[PDB]
Structures are given as C-alpha cells and as structure tokens.
Design a protein around this ligand. Sequence first.
Ligand SMILES: NS(=O)(=O)c1cccc(NC(=O)NCCNCc2ccccc2)c1
Ligand SMILES: [Zn+2]
Length: 257
Amino acid sequence: DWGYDDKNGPEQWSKLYPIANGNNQSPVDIKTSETKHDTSLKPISVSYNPATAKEIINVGHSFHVNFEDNDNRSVLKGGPFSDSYRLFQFHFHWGSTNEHGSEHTVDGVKYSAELHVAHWNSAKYSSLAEAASKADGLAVIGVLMKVGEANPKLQKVLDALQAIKTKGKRAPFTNFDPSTLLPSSLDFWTYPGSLTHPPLYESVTWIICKESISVSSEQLAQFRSLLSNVEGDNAVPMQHNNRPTQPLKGRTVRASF
Ligand SMILES: NS(=O)(=O)c1cccc(NC(=O)NCCNCc2ccccc2)c1
Ligand SMILES: [Zn+2]
C-alpha cells in the first residue's frame, strides 16, 4: 500500500514499482533555458461537454472528479497530438504548506498546488484500462497553481468536498466543464513522462501550461482538511500528495512559445 508518508512515500516507491527509477518519470523541473521551441506544435484544443461530469471520490491520498468516458463528448486535440484524447478525470496535488505543493516546477520554483486534467487515447485504444500502460496512451494537462487571490472557478469543487470527507466516500458531481479551470493562455511545454504516483506507468504525454492559475491560502486549506482515514477512525488530514521532481534522463522539454 503506497502512500506519501516517509514509510510508503515517493522515495520508497521503487521497492514495489521499479519503474520509479525509469527514464521517463514525472514530474520534472522545467529549465526554460534548456527548452526547445517546436514550430510544429499546434495549439491545444479542448472541447468538454459538462454533461460528462459524473462523480467526485475520496481516494485516500487525494480526491478525483471522474467523467463519463463512453464517447468523444469531451476531447483534447492539437498540441503534439495527432489522435483525439478523451477526458476521464481531473484532480489536484498540494503540499503541507503554501511554499510547495505543485509537482512540476519551473526553473526551480515550487508552486502551491497543481491541477491535472487527464485524458486517454481513444483513437488507438478502446478503454482507459487498455490505454493506461501504452506510451501514447495518456495525455495530462498540468496547471501550476500560485497562492494569491481566491479562485472563484474552484467553487463547485470546493463546495463538494464536505460530502466526501473520508476515504471511499463518493458523490454525484454533474454539469461541469473543467476547461473553466484552465488559464487564459494555453501556451505550453510538453515532454514524454509518466503517471506521478503508482503504478507510475511511462504512458503520459505532459502538457504543462506556461500561465499559472490562482488559489487562496484558505482554498488550499480546504484540500488539506480532507481526511485520508475511513469514517469512524481517527482523523488523518491529507496534508500533501506531491511527488518530488525526477531526472530528465536526456529528455527534451519542448515549448509551444
Ligand atoms: N498525477 S497524474 O500522473 O496526472 C494521473 C493521471 C491519471 C490518473 C492517475 N491516477 C489514478 O487515477 N488513480 C486511481 C485509479 N488507479 C488506476 C489507474 C492506473 C493507471 C492509469 C489510470 C488509472 C494519475
Ligand atoms: Zn496528478
């Protein structure tokens, strides 16, 4: 049972998941002096249908907002991709204090949290379960979240957490378009990488937005007030769930800008 504390956390994951020491691990530090501008990168195109929003779930280490993924009502196109990728989930990472919490860093700078919008390749594969281990199977948009003014676009998500306070609790989460959470500019970096927690499959093409979005200290506190224990047990707040950055191992981070 992997986790984020010192006994089961990122620096121990390799004992159970050897790919943690792989060549395409995520997240990474994006050194902007070493990025390579790619004129062939197309703009990112997201077209999400709010009716595909399904459920919010406390998964112990985090919470997930899941989407109906039976058809192409909600898709990501463009960027480095030739195929269409079908939305299936968004979630966040945060840290114990505001000084850290993002997974990716930019020129060594740690942000307070990070939003992940995850999709799977429905052009080549028939299900998330099939796509999840394929090198071209997953596409995840990462948005760095900078502490500052309260972000009103997070409201529906934050209001839902009171119904999923403890591990395993699930509740309907409907009529929501998560493209409303993205920054106004979709200038981006991209690199081949991995899921940032077990099973750490090197199946993710990362799209990291250049522009951050805001989040307030109190909104971050709502994340950390989620409980990792099951109802009835001693309360264990979800203090943090971000993985440290990993070596590029010769990968190249491309810039759309
Ligand atoms: N932080 S992330 O790298 O952007 C990222 C992106 C997408 C999914 C996850 N994790 C989870 O969805 N966990 C809950 C269910 N686990 C089964 C599973 C295995 C492989 C792929 C999807 C689902 C993490
Ligand atoms: Zn994530």
